[PDB]
Paper text:
The human [name]+ [name] p97, also known as [name], a potential target for cancer therapeutics, plays a vital role in the clearing of misfolded proteins. p97 dysfunction is also known to play a crucial role in several neurodegenerative disorders, such as MultiSystem Proteinopathy 1 (MSP-1) and Familial Amyotrophic Lateral Sclerosis (ALS). pmcp97 is a member of the classic clade of [name]+ ATPases and is an essential cellular enzyme. p97 is composed of six protomers forming a homo-hexamer with an N-terminal domain (NTD) and two tandem [name] domains D1 and D2 (1). p97 is an essential protein in regulating cellular homeostasis from membrane fusion, Endoplasmic Reticulum-Associated Degradation, Mitochondrial-Associated Degradation (MAD), Chromatin-Associated Degradation to NF-κB activation (2). Critical functions for p97 include the translocation and restructuring of proteins from large cellular structures such as organelle membranes and extraction of ubiquitinated client proteins to facilitate their degradation through the ubiquitin-proteasome system. Here, we present cryo-EM structural analyses of four disease mutants p97R155H, p97R191Q, p97A232E, p97D592N, as well as p97E470D, implicated in resistance to the drug CB-5083, a potent p97 inhibitor.
CB-5083 is a potent inhibitor of p97 function, with an IC50 of ∼10 nM. In order to assess the effect of CB-5083 binding in the context of full-length protein, we carried out cryo-EM studies of p97WT bound to CB-5083 in the presence of either ADP or ATPγS. The cryo-EM structure of the ADP- CB-5083- p97WT complex resolved at an overall resolution 2.5 Å allows unambiguous positioning of CB-5083 in the D2 domain. The inhibitor is held in place by a combination of polar interactions mediated through its terminal amide side chain and central quinazoline scaffold, and nonpolar interactions involving the pendant phenyl group. The tertiary and quaternary structures of the D1 and D2 domains remain the same under both conditions, demonstrating that when CB-5083 is bound to the D2 domain, the conformation of the D1 domain is locked and unresponsive to either the presence or the identity of the bound nucleotide. Importantly, the N-domain is in the “down” position when either ADP or ATPγS occupies the D1 nucleotide-binding site. CB-5083, as an ATP-competitive inhibitor, can exert its effects on p97 function by blocking the allosteric conformational changes required for transition from conformation I to conformation II. Although CB-5083 binding site overlaps with the nucleotide-binding site of the D2 domain and shares interactions with some of the residues that interact with ADP/ATP, the key inter-protomer interaction between R766 and the γ-phosphate of ATP is missing in the CB-5083-bound structure, preventing the generation of the type of quaternary conformational changes seen upon ATPγS binding to p97WT.
Numbering used by the authors:
A (entry chain E): 21 to 707, 728 to 775
B (entry chain F): 260 to 707, 728 to 775
Write the structure that this text describes.
Amino acid sequence: NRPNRLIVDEAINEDNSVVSLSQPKMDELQLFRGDTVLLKGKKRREAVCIVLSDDTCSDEKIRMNRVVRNNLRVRLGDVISIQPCPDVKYGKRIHVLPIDDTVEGITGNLFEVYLKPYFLEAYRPIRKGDIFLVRGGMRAVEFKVVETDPSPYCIVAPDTVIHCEGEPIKREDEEESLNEVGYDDIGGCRKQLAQIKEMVELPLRHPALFKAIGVKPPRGILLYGPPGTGKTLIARAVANETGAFFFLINGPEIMSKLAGESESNLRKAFEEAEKNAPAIIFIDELDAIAPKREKTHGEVERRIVSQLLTLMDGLKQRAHVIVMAATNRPNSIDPALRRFGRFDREVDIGIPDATGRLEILQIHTKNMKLADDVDLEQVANETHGHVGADLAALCSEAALQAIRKKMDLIDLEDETIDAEVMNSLAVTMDDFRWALSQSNPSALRETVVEVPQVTWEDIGGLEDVKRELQELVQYPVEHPDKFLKFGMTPSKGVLFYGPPGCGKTLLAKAIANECQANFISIKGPELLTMWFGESEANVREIFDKARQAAPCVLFFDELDSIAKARGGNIGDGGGAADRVINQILTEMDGMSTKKNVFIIGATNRPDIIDPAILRPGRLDQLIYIPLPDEKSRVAILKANLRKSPVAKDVDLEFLAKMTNGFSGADLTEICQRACKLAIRESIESEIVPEIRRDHFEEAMRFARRSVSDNDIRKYEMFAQTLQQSRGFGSFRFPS
Amino acid sequence: NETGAFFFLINGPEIMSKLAGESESNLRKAFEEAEKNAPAIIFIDELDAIAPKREKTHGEVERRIVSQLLTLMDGLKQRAHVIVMAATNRPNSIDPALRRFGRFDREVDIGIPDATGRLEILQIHTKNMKLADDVDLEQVANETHGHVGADLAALCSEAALQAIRKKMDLIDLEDETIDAEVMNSLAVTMDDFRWALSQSNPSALRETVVEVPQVTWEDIGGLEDVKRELQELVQYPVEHPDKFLKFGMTPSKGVLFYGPPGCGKTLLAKAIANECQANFISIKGPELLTMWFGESEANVREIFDKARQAAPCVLFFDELDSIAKARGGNIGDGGGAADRVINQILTEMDGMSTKKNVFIIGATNRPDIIDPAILRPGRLDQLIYIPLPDEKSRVAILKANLRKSPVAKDVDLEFLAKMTNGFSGADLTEICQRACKLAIRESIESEIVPEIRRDHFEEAMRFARRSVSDNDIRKYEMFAQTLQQSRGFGSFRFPS
Ligand SMILES: Cc1cc2c(C(N)=O)cccc2n1-c1nc2c(c(NCc3ccccc3)n1)COCC2
Ligand SMILES: Cc1cc2c(C(N)=O)cccc2n1-c1nc2c(c(NCc3ccccc3)n1)COCC2
Ligand SMILES: Nc1ncnc2c1ncn2[C@@H]1O[C@H](COP(=O)(O)OP(=O)(O)O)[C@@H](O)[C@H]1O
């Protein structure tokens, strides 16, 4: 079967011309890490690149870049043959010129100022009839060769000369512009984008197989998340890189036109897409199409909603059309649109984490050069409530300040702006310091679903809790098989209790990292808001988005907030049962045990917690979080001081030994007071940048202890209320 | 298709899709074109989208179309054979004027298939795709309970794409026409189905599950006192209808039993349903307390409606005292023990027919706060007490918990059940769970044995709780021979 062709996929490397393979790949073709490789394809064209060795990408797979996928005219799901080509090449004369589509506003020489600097120390090959793309110079421009030395023998070298004629040649329809959006342009959405690959690549890349088998492909995908998360360029990229006819309808334009032709327009949208098979239809605004919850107004609204329902219901085999849609909330859509055959597959995307946000900055700043002291990693750390469009706007906004701080002194007012100054436009760090000050982000109060960064290693002590948490949620995650072998269902959730300020939230975060699971935190105010507001559909989406992000962990902070607000143990004439806890009970009863979703309840007063939530099957597992011991207190001190200059003589072991009945909050305020004293001494001494032993010794005087002994006694009475290890302590079997 | 009748399908959204004025004409001419194709059959797919006459009250054309349908179905004389079937989600989501005589008199309610019902629905959708010798569809239809018939139809295809994707990467056969000599080798694997139940999010999860249980009286040991009265209280009117008309005694409408928590009240009700071969409907506490807080009290209407159409059925109310606990209990507020939800249940139970085989079972752990009116004769006059499991019944609880675990020969469950006396079913359950946890932990740590050993149970026996106190047993008994009263007339002699 000629075992030489392999499938093509996307490369995670950010390099321009780098091809990554697996370990048993170059050992068969006896090629080194800097040899010459020749690749072929359709249209009777060849290619040449540089093979790079990598053993971390995958097990047996070849990577392949975007700048050459369009150059060789290759699309996904195709076969590619690779063979070594040890041919000595040497370029002598070159002649490249850009296309008159991206050179607007550029004058003067442009060959000895951009092309010469980037060619050196690269030795990149080039074949005849190729459109390479280069990023930099505050723009995205390309060049095309029309006449040079006979192919091949093309090697870049500083000794090579170049020349120009002065007449750009327009591009044709055979090639595709690389300025559009592809898979490499998506940053942060890794797990969510991975799903669309296994749902839209089968029907669009292999049509004859679907008109051969009886499998019904999905007829609709609903994307989610707040505006700006990137629901549109995802749909445009999965169309641009799949060769499917992308047809965009926004959703407000349907209501923009007169009543009577709006239905006809999105009707004919479906037939014009069908004849362009394979096709892909994306509806940008859908909550503005079917808000069938409180509107109940407008004869044409229902007519358009039903017209869409009919157009998507009659999606038989016929041709390959995929109808994706975007909206903000799951409940803001007509439930009749969620039926089978209209929207069966739903993918929810959200705010990218720090790692997800880091990869979204450089994609938007690849054109603007940075300085040696400008790092994008630290700027994606203090921001947590920024949507993907927020940072896209922030990059440009910093760019105007960067150019404004120099145009005042340059004072070059003319009709046409010379292209010899963009090379000197380097952004500074102060350009970004102002960027996070006046920028007001949109998505700030939402469910942050991110994997934490706190592990068990950075938590000292608490071996008693470490051992039971690891055997209660980690075992069903890392060893599913040993549970079916023993016929034991995993526990649904655990509620732990303890004095305030002892790290219950951090413990839940740490157990999420051990299982490599997502983490969702619901604090007290979010739980008590729906109690006062009499709006109790909010737990529905909480439990919905907790289960779609499998595997996840659900954490409820200060669960006793409603009981405290109602009175507690007695309060009013009623008991300890309310409506919000009832909704949580209903949602937990209906969950599937085979899923890896896990609910963790945190409380400081477990005596006022409703007994029904602790019933077996919901939160039967109760563990007690005590005060940190000597080993765990050092961890709290060093976590607080990990960002501060600590002197060598400042011994944290002794400080943690001295404080015994101290909570995490008590150590936190000790560290904060020491830092305040150090800052004040540094400020007053100006008229030293190191925290000294005296700072901690003096701040140790105002040492509080917020947790009293009576509290520890009342928590214990609760603890071996449920321990009861009496009676059957000594048992001997007969034989 | 199998009756040779002209099938004409109208969805229901297409009526609202077209302009106002011809939509009425289209579903009008739909009826005459069906009549001349006699015999005919008309099915309306979306009907809740046609007549949502409960909260809409908006749109002149909506009422016009609803009335046009009412006129088209009212004028259904003999003439020709046309049958107008329709589909909708809820009974209350339909215009009540459509339920009149001559429009929709016959109603059939279908629901989620059970494990047996789901098993026969898999192979019909996978008859074309060949399976392996280790792929069994029975075990995959067991852990799923909230899957609609379309859910598994989608799941089969979804597993098919994974099955072909795991091999197309290595086959690497890219061409225009795909050869037919490879489908014969497309065999689905069990791992194709393991991933299928992970990312698939089912739709119907929070609904009334109406299925026949699988727990019988044989697997329940002991409880002969309750076995004898339950068998003579609901089984007799089901298996011997004639002996009741012969003796002129009406069957009891329902029985409420009480007992300490975690003793198997739900399992007892399930077992008595299998003995009578009757359907079982369970209503837990949260579903009862949701409508109390929500002030939405039409929910008991459909509960009692779907409990009576599935004749014969058994209706089970779990923790009936939930509303009383939420309101305070014996005293609580200035009010008594009467509320709105229990009032609706009383109204629905008073209006039921005794000749039907529907049966209501109430379960509670605090019968002192139960409203007295629900225990009035004719509604729940029969009260039976569920005690702690005895030695014979505790072995059943242990073996039910351990029926899926590797039990060693030396592990004697009879002795373990003998040792624990005042232990509830929950206490034995946590003992078994703790022993399984210890065995799993030892197996995991020993890797760096696949059998539960005697030591696992012996060590886990140390943390043996007893959640039910003696004061609780005393307070339940005070309630029990509160209503026993076998004094006074204990010795009677007739004259002759
Ligand atoms: C700033 C900080 C404040 C704080 C508090 C508090 N009431 O201020 C309570 C518990 C932990 C706390 N931390 C804290 N924060 C961190 C860590 C850490 N050490 C491990 C730990 C966790 C729970 C328990 C013990 C010790 N402690 C470890 O690395 C991540 C951040
Ligand atoms: C897992 C299980 C837990 C449990 C509990 C509990 N609070 O954990 C209470 C009562 C019965 C329980 N079962 C249980 N489950 C089953 C059976 C069975 N034995 C019969 C029985 C029923 C009620 C009573 C006695 C004994 N017991 C029998 O086969 C079906 C499943
Ligand atoms: N997750 C993301 N990855 C890459 N770019 C993004 C992302 N989210 C937003 N952007 C950028 O923000 C800009 C605005 O996106 P926008 O059209 O608001 O997305 P949507 O239509 O989904 O709200 C786009 O040009 C896009 O490049």
